[PDB]
Amino acid sequence: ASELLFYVNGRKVIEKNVDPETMLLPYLRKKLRLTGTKYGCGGGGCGACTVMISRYNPITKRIRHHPANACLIPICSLYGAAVTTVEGIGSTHTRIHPVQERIAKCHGTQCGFCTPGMVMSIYTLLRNHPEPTLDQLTDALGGNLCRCTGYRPIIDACKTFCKPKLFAEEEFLPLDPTQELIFPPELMIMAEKQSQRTRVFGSERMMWFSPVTLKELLEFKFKYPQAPVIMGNTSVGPEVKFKGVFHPVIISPDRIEELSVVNHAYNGLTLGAGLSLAQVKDILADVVQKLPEEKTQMYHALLKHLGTLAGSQIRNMASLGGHIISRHPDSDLNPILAVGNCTLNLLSKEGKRQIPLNEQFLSKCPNADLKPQEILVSVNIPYSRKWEFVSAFRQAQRQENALAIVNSGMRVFFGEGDGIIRELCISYGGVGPATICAKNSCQKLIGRHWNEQMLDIACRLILNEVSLLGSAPGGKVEFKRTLIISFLFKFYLEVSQILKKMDPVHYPSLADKYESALEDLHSKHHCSTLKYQNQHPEDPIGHPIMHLSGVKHATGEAIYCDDMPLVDQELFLTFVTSSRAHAKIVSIDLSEALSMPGVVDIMTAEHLSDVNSFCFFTEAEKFLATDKVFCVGQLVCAVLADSEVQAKRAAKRVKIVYQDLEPLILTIEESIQHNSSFKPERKLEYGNVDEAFKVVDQILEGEIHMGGQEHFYMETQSMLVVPKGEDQEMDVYVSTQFPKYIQDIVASTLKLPANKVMCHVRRVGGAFGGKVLKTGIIAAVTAFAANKHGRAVRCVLERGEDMLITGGRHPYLGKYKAGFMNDGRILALDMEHYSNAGASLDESLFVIEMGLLKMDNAYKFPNLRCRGWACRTNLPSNTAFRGFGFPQAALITESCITEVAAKCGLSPEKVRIINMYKEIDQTPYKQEINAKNLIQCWRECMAMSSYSLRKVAVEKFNAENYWKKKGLAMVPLKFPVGLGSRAAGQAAALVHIYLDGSVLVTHGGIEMGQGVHTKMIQVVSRELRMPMSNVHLRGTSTETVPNANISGGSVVADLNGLAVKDACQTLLKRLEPIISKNPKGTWKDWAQTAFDESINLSAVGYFRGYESDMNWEKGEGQPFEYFVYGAACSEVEIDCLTGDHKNIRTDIVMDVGCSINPAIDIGQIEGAFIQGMGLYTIEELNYSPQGILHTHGPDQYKIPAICDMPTELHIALLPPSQNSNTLYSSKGLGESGVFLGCSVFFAIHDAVSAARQERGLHLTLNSPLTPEKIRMACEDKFTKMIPRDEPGSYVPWNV
Amino acid sequence: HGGIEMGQGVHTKMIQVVSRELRMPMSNVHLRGTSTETVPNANISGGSVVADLNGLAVKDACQTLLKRLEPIISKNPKGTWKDWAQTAFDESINLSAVG
Amino acid sequence: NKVMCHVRRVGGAFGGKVLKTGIIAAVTAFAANKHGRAVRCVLERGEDML
Amino acid sequence: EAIYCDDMPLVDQELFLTFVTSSRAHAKIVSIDLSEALSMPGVVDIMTAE
Ligand SMILES: Cc1cc2nc3c(=O)[nH]c(=O)nc-3n(C[C@H](O)[C@H](O)[C@H](O)COP(=O)(O)OP(=O)(O)OC[C@H]3O[C@@H](n4cnc5c(N)ncnc54)[C@H](O)[C@@H]3O)c2cc1C
Ligand SMILES: O=C(c1ccc(OCCN2CCCCC2)cc1)c1c(-c2ccc(O)cc2)sc2cc(O)ccc12
Ligand SMILES: O=C(c1ccc(OCCN2CCCCC2)cc1)c1c(-c2ccc(O)cc2)sc2cc(O)ccc12
Ligand SMILES: Nc1nc2c(c(=O)[nH]1)N[C@H]1C(S)=C(S)[C@@H](COP(=O)(O)O)O[C@H]1N2
Ligand SMILES: Nc1nc2c(c(=O)[nH]1)N[C@H]1C(S)=C(S)[C@@H](COP(=O)(O)O)O[C@H]1N2
Ligand code: MOS
Ligand code: MOS
Ligand code: FES
Ligand code: FES
């Protein structure tokens, strides 16, 4: 009946009869009402829930601070400890901590959802290293993810703690050592008492025991043999959350000294099972410094793989003993330990026992495993002998914080006087259910020498022993087979080199071209430069004004939808989704779930009666599935319960029986094959392509595939629906891009006029087009439940169900036939576009239309035919995305240009200049354009980036390196901006002036992090001639501005700015006579005089929209208002033996017109570029042949992290030009920079061609260009040597 | 509007005004309340003139909207307010007015 | 522009819900801001008449 | 079903404010003693003019 006592932000927290299942993250937000700490993914991978844990050790008299992810911490493990959140280090009503002030003022926030995690990771680092290096700060952020900023401004804020810019660094608060938080004195007293008592907590579902003595821990291990021993909960935690595991009894000890031991012996090193991985990293890093290389072989290999293991938070939570026992097949440490003669020190009531850490232990043979009543105390890792060498290798989707596809540990021992292999141990991870060893191959290699024929024999032996079925889980089978022998080759080169160093007489030397295979791709030197431009001083237009919510982002005070306080008696709604891609729902059983605790209601399609459908565009479609399902993740049931936990528990016991249906369509080609119904065609024609193909020198046929993309907004789908209690009024608070649409679908579902339903949006934590259609579906179903039961209803999706429900960017297939001259002119181009639409074709026709109107990019194709189709599949329906078809259509065009370049013997850059638009030219849709800035962006990027010089240096590197290659590429940009009609571009605003002079402004646009609200206050400040501090904005609401269009299409700030300007001018006109009589007066004087003279101080602003038109039958029109121009150059280096690659440098020039806010505009270029970079390289969605999205292990989705950012990044804004049509001659940058990411794609493509051309192979690389695709294209003796399975003889993991 | 409902039925009288001026049944109109966030600088609800003066402001906003919509009303006199409102949107005519 | 007042309906006033109402609101708002909490104030009939 | 001001639902963690009023028609406030009231259950704050 113990009490749980710990501290949060200096305040004491006591809980009586605490539920042991309580986790820290929901406890902070709901019970303590501290909503700064966010939910991001719930698996410990994104860092949005980063907090600081502080403990006091009474034996050593020292206070330790360590970061942690609150989503994995059970609060029962916090007894006597101190938590610190973002709110605990500062706020706007106390003091702003320097970390908060700088990340905000350096423009390190956009949507702000990731900021509290970034702050806590930086703050915790500074509490441990007050005078740090940049490497220490970037390592601390390795497990912190951002979708908006591109990480550059956050590194800038990190740099200021180390020793024409966008921030005044000299005005920052210095780091005050007297202001830092004090460890709660009471916790120090409790630790001094050194209690021996075992703490006990419990509920009806779980028993929790926390022994504090070794004797008690052994007693509970004996009485509850099957109970897990929780340390950091980073293996058990994710398994109970995502795999339905449940433990009725938990043993979680508290700082047992015997498990924290660190013994420096004569023969080796003994590390306790309770040490965290971060502590082991530090212990080993100290040992390798004070001991000679001869003995520290095992410790260097372990240090290598501890550097890339997850992030700083997980490393500070996870234990060494937990790592060994959990026996993950993808473990990075267990393959190294398996080859190092390590032994495990076990303990129980019976006594002590020592077992080897071998292959049988890692395979969980009960003969070589722990006994049920045994614990692991410590592990012994021996010193290495002379002539003993150990190496570790790994390859994953991303350099850091990603589970390995294959890893390995290898050890070899030579005889002093023979050079003969005496011992050899090789183990691999990620190639089976457990870590395996090649004990048979190794034993056969015993007695040989280290030379060519040993390596060739070893390869064939290894491949036979460590075999993989073509159906092996995780997929990437041919990649895994190649990596297995590629690592062996690297180990061969490593050992061959040190032997030649130690024994020059008996060994040959490495070939010069082979030596860089030993150097890994690594860099932490993140450099960058920015270039922009330079009216009264009061006028903020053109100034780098910080995001209005920047500081509130950094303090956790920004309210997102789920941060809203608990509404009285609100319920929670969760969905049961489809587990089949195309099947018949034969029956649904709700009997069990309905009877479960807290369940209020469960709704199927028949409970929604006639409001289960809604006409979004051309046809009415279901909210909930009826008799059939047409993709996984389709909504089927909606569970309504008193609490979120009760809702998810009941939803799991809803029972649905399926009967699969043919056909099962998953790919575009399957969709074309199985389709025979009429499909609406979209077509562009310019010139005469049939005539032109008879004059060209050459003809070329090619095709490229391009995968999709998850939005990965850091804030998942979130909404709160509150009925008023009168006249069926409904208030809908939802994270959406389109409040008008939420209002329509909610009112329709409730059979109400629109004046009864209002939608309010203050801010959105990222959207990128993925918070529109299905957001309304969920909002309509949630509102139906709220009205039915007269209760507020909240609905927030977890990351997993969010990715299954929402859908992502349209995958593409592009087929082209190109007729070109021998010098590069493409006189004829016959192009075909196919989009994978998913189960619904709602927004797939619009992206096809935009793809055709944008596929020309920067090139004048005199004879061009372009056609496009949207293809239905049995996959989640795909939505809009940043770019709106341009990132797909332009890559397909750039792929065709790259293929034409190969035929002509010219670099792709030369073919680009010869096909580029002229200064005055014409588009395929017969719109006249001015491309002066297109050419200028190209020239300035060539000069700024020193392309020609670096081109020679890359060719020189590739001529001197065989297993490493560098690549270089530059692509141009023409991103046109414009909607389909004038009505689609209209915007409105509402401005009040109160009698004290202050101003309230609101408009129809939505803040997603792009800073539209900041830009509107900048407009009000100029038009009304008042400082921005006199203006304020609350949010966006259908109750104040009606009939607002979707926040999207790169025009949000442009059009709403014109509406805000319109209202400000109306007010200034009314006040001109009062202005004249008192020119020296304040706005308080002018407002009061206006009231006294009966002059209205409220005005509606309105803009009718740009004139835009497109006649799709004729294929002509004036659809676009202006064009964003740009150029991007990127350089990379690839590892031909593994597929790894490093982004070395990127240079970007952008035509932005006159930037209203260069800080925000540059931040939009950086974020778009990084988002496109992930689209073309590392972001990959894996589906099974049954249509199931794979999300565990190496199938986890990876967005770019800090390690993926280019080490060098130069961005320059083109000098301004006049554009009297747009607001202040500005241009909308939001979507343009995404395509610039493919400069990395074609830089990798360049490097792959260099290796292929040198190896004599005479290339279509699909997107995303993953390490799997890079490695397999670099064909060598290993690619040819691997076994291959007959296609169709096995069911693959992926398609 | 700026007036306060304290039992005298001002809100009832305002929707009566909207019903006349816009030629629509009162069930097509709705009012939620009074807020400084929607109507600023409103005088006290007192002096026997609350319905008088706010009625003239509501009448002013209705006439501004009916002015904007007269060309659309002319071409489709038999249409509903749903038809007229959507056509106004399609022709980029503002449907919010301050009285 | 930082302070908004919302009124749906009043259960009778007859002039007696102006000046003193603002004083009570100003004092209540001071407490609410001082403690970061929402604050409710309702008067009983006796103290109301005083 | 008509919502008057006090009919609004309990908002999360809201407090309540009540007033101590004068019992004299014309006098001077010699002293105010809050020691007992401040220590009583639930009391968050007591505010005087200063
Ligand atoms: C986001 C994320 C990223 C990751 N990335 C990587 C990665 O890149 N590479 C990698 O190799 N791993 C990775 N991991 C896995 C991680 O290294 C392990 O989950 C961790 O080391 C397990 O230690 P723990 O203390 O969290 O164990 P727990 O989850 O607390 O326990 C796991 C198991 O160990 C048992 N156990 C623990 N201590 C003892 C003991 N003394 N005696 C007996 N049994 C014991 C428990 O009973 C339980 O069965 C990642 C995990 C996460 C969540
Ligand atoms: O016994 C040898 C050895 C034997 C013959 C060698 O000949 C080198 C090639 N030779 C050059 C002169 C003309 C004939 C060919 C070299 C090393 C040892 C080694 C070796 C290395 C590579 C290889 O492919 C085979 C063996 S390594 C070694 C270590 C020792 O302590 C003792 C002997 C050795
Ligand atoms: O902007 C639209 C939209 C606009 C007009 C439409 O017209 C449909 C035809 N209908 C005819 C009768 C009058 C009303 C319109 C459809 C969608 C988008 C949507 C919408 C808006 C309102 C609504 O009630 C339902 C759906 S959903 C959507 C997703 C996008 O990615 C882009 C635009 C959109
Ligand atoms: N931080 C952030 N930036 C963003 C987005 C977002 O969700 N978050 N959305 C992008 C998309 S899809 C569009 S269309 C534009 C919309 O705003 P704008 O028109 O003012 O650029 O912002 C872009 N930039
Ligand atoms: N039911 C009701 N009627 C009422 C009042 C009231 O509080 N309740 N106030 C009176 C007062 S003080 C005035 S000044 C007027 C204000 O509204 P009117 O201007 O529309 O008459 O309503 C009068 N009638
Ligand atoms: O245009 Mo951005 O909303 S897909
Ligand atoms: O005129 Mo009534 O507000 S006293
Ligand atoms: S790391 Fe916990 S929510 Fe992402
Ligand atoms: S600011 Fe980092 S996720 Fe948006």
Side-chain angles (χ1 to χ4, degrees), chain A residues 386-652:
Chain A
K386 191 178 178 199
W387 304 106
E388 194 172 22
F389 313 116
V390 182
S391 288
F393 308 101
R394 77 188 299 273
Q395 184 57 45
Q397 202 76 11
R398 164 175 86 197
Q399 225 165 234
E400 280 185 302
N401 195 18
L403 303 185
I405 296 141
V406 182
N407 52 38
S408 179
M410 327 196 161
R411 179 186 69 87
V412 64
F413 179 60
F414 294 104
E416 176 101 33
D418 47 12
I420 274 151
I421 298 159
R422 297 233 227 151
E423 303 171 35
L424 176 70
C425 201
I426 301 166
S427 62
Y428 290 103
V431 291
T435 294
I436 63 200
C437 296
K439 64 230 163 303
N440 301 327
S441 300
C442 285
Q443 114 185 109
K444 278 184 208 194
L445 297 157
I446 297 305
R448 283 193 209 261
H449 289 93
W450 209 259
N451 52 26
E452 250 304 314
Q453 76 185 318
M454 191 273 318
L455 167 68
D456 286 1
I457 296 152
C459 287
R460 283 152 229 297
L461 290 182
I462 293 279
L463 287 136
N464 265 348
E465 197 175 1
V466 303
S467 101
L468 291 133
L469 275 52
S471 67
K476 307 191 182 74
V477 183
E478 276 160 359
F479 187 30
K480 289 200 187 173
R481 288 172 184 144
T482 299
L483 283 175
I484 270 171
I485 55 184
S486 291
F487 294 156
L488 189 71
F489 180 55
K490 281 189 163 192
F491 186 55
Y492 173 76
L493 298 171
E494 298 193 351
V495 171
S496 291
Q497 198 192 39
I498 183 135
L499 286 167
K500 177 59 185 192
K501 184 268 172 153
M502 295 185 49
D503 194 1
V505 176
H506 296 11
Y507 296 101
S509 230
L510 256 301
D512 298 315
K513 282 87 172 303
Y514 276 36
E515 259 146 23
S516 71
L518 305 171
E519 293 162 65
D520 287 314
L521 311 190
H522 42 59
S523 212
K524 301 192 175 79
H525 306 304
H526 303 94
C527 148
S528 101
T529 71
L530 302 176
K531 199 60 210 37
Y532 59 101
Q533 269 303 317
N534 294 333
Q535 188 191 283
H536 314 120
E538 74 71 35
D539 188 352
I541 297 297
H543 284 102
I545 304 297
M546 170 186 11
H547 196 295
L548 288 168
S549 289
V551 170
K552 286 194 297 298
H553 295 153
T555 59
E557 295 179 80
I559 306 298
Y560 302 83
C561 185
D562 193 46
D563 301 336
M564 292 192 189
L566 188 78
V567 175
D568 193 46
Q569 305 184 302
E570 74 169 59
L571 302 165
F572 197 90
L573 185 75
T574 196
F575 292 96
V576 170
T577 54
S578 173
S579 49
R580 300 299 180 81
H582 187 220
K584 181 85 167 222
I585 314 167
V586 321
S587 70
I588 305 185
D589 187 23
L590 307 180
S591 52
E592 179 172 7
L594 275 174
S595 65
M596 299 199 66
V599 183
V600 167
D601 195 10
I602 299 179
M603 283 147 18
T604 65
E606 94 176 71
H607 301 152
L608 268 56
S609 150
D610 65 317
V611 304
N612 190 45
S613 92
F614 183 76
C615 193
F616 310 87
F617 305 95
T618 67
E619 29 169 3
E621 335 182 34
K622 293 137 187 214
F623 301 160
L624 298 183
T626 61
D627 38 46
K628 284 162 226 103
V629 288
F630 297 95
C631 68
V632 303
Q634 210 199 326
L635 308 180
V636 180
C637 297
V639 184
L640 186 68
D642 283 324
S643 85
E644 165 188 18
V645 159
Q646 295 169 310
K648 301 267 175 46
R649 277 181 201 158
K652 285 188 206 309

Side-chain angles (χ1 to χ4, degrees), chain A residues 616-619 621 711 737-738 741 768-777 805-810 812 835-851 869-872 876-881 884-885 888 1046:
Chain A
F616 310 87
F617 305 95
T618 67
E619 29 169 3
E621 335 182 34
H711 305 90
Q737 289 168 265
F738 205 173
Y741 158 66
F768 314 101
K771 281 175 179 171
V772 183
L773 214 82
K774 258 154 195 333
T775 308
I777 301 270
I805 289 160
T806 308
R809 194 194 287 288
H810 285 89
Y812 255 63
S835 80
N836 194 334
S840 211
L841 306 153
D842 274 335
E843 19 207 353
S844 313
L845 177 87
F846 304 168
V847 314
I848 283 298
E849 285 168 359
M850 279 312 155
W869 304 263
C871 303
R872 193 190 315 262
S877 181
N878 285 319
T879 68
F881 212 121
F884 212 153
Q888 302 101 312
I1046 187 173

Side-chain angles (χ1 to χ4, degrees), chain B residues 4 6-10 13 45-52, chain C residues 10-15:
Chain B
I4 295 284
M6 50 198 96
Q8 83 278 42
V10 59
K13 282 166 163 172
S45 281
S48 270
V49 287
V50 183
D52 261 350
Chain C
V10 171
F14 315 100

